């Protein structure tokens, strides 16, 4: 189809205690005995949404949605204690064993494409196919484009607000100036910065401006989102190799995949989708023209709904 499936209820939900201070939220909607699928939300620190359920066929898919760690209803709110790429990879497996799935489709866009890759490349037997979107491999060039010099040139008026709170010395490294504030003993300080990191993204993640970019300002979300995002970026996704994710594709090349990406996606450039495709020829790349970063862009949504329907009713 072109649009989302109609709204529906999760058939199950709960909290999985990780054992190191974390209790992660997880839903279960679709079909009990259907094709097992997992949704991997993006923007490190963003959270799942009821809309993420309407993205898969109700009668054919059993989708597992889960809040990441310190975000969403996942308990330890804004907790950056034991919250890295590799810890999250462990949570996907727990949820798998728990869910009782031996292998499933990994649906994840933006940061979720990152985690999808990082998970697929360490558990190649647990993914049947992958549907990636707005590819994000976490290379230094990519963090620099959205948080230092690049996206800035397209939203000069929006980036001045993000810079307003930084001293000139502090302006030569936005990511770090923001890690100070975000990890301030003072929380009013860390909320002022959190609201400025969040809104920047919510405002450049769509081609045309939408009113729903306001949600990124909301204190709680903005506190978790900003500090979790800046956390992972500060550690470079916790990968030791700028290109560990590209330079590790052979391990999953054998896995059916579809790659959707907006030509004008300002959060993660097309260059990432192309680079990954240039390395994974068996994957079907779809550079949707006239669109931005958000999954819900009409052109990106289409290809996503098409990939999903195909990967299930093959």
UniProtKB/Swiss-Prot annotation:
Residues 38-293 form the AB hydrolase-1 domain. One of its GO terms (cellular component) is cytoplasm. It is an enzyme of class 3 (hydrolase). Keywords: Aminopeptidase, Cytoplasm, Hydrolase, Protease. This is Proline iminopeptidase. The active site is at residues 110, 265, 293. Specifically catalyzes the removal of N-terminal proline residues from peptides. Its main location: cytoplasm. One of its GO terms (molecular function) is aminopeptidase activity. It comes from the Bacteria. It is found in: Cytoplasm. GO terms for biological process: proteolysis. Belongs to the peptidase S33 family. Monomer. It catalyses: Release of N-terminal proline from a peptide. Its EC number is 3.4.11.5. The keyword Cytoplasm applies. SUPFAM superfamilies: alpha/beta-Hydrolases. InterPro entries: AB_hydrolase_1, AB_hydrolase_fold, Peptidase_S33, Pro_iminopeptidase. The gene is pip.
């Amino acid at each position: 189809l072109r649009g989302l499936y109609p709204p529906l209820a999760a058939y199950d939900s709960g909290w999985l205690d990780t054992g190191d201070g974390h209790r992660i939220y997880w839903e279960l909607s679709g079909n009990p005995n259907g094709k097992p699928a997992v949704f991997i939300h993006g923007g490190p620190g963003g959270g799942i949404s009821p809309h993420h359920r309407q993205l898969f066929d109700p009668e054919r898919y059993k989708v597992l949605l889960f809040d990441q760690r310190g975000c969403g209803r996942s308990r330890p709110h804004a907790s950056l204690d034991n919250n890295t790429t590799w810890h999250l990879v462990a949570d996907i497996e727990r949820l798998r064993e728990m869910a009782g799935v031996e292998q499933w489709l990994v649906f994840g866009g933006s940061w979720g494409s990152t985690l999808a890759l990082a998970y697929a490349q360490t558990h190649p037997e647990r993914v049947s196919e992958m549907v990636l979107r707005g590819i994000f491999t976490l290379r230094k060039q990519r963090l620099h484009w959205y948080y230092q010099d690049g996206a800035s040139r397209f939203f000069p008026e929006k980036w001045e607000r993000v810079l307003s709170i930084l001293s000139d010395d502090e302006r030569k490294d936005v990511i770090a100036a923001y890690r100070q504030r975000l990890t301030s003993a003072d929380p009013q300080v860390q909320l002022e910065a959190a609201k400025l990191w969040s809104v920047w993204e919510g405002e450049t993640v769509t081609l045309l401006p939408s009113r729903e970019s306001a949600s990124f300002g909301e204190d709680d979300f903005a506190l978790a989102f900003a500090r979790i995002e800046n956390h992972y970026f500060t550690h470079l996704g916790f990968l030791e190799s700028d290109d560990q994710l590209l330079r590790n594709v052979p391990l999953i090349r054998h896995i059916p995949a579809v790659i959707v990406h907006g030509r004008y996606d300002m959060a993660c450039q097309v260059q990432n989708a192309w680079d990954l495709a240039k390395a994974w020829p068996e994957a079907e790349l779809h550079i949707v023209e006239g669109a931005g970063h958000s999954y819900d862009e009409p052109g990106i949504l289409h290809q996503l709904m098409i990939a999903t329907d195909r990967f299930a009713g093959k």
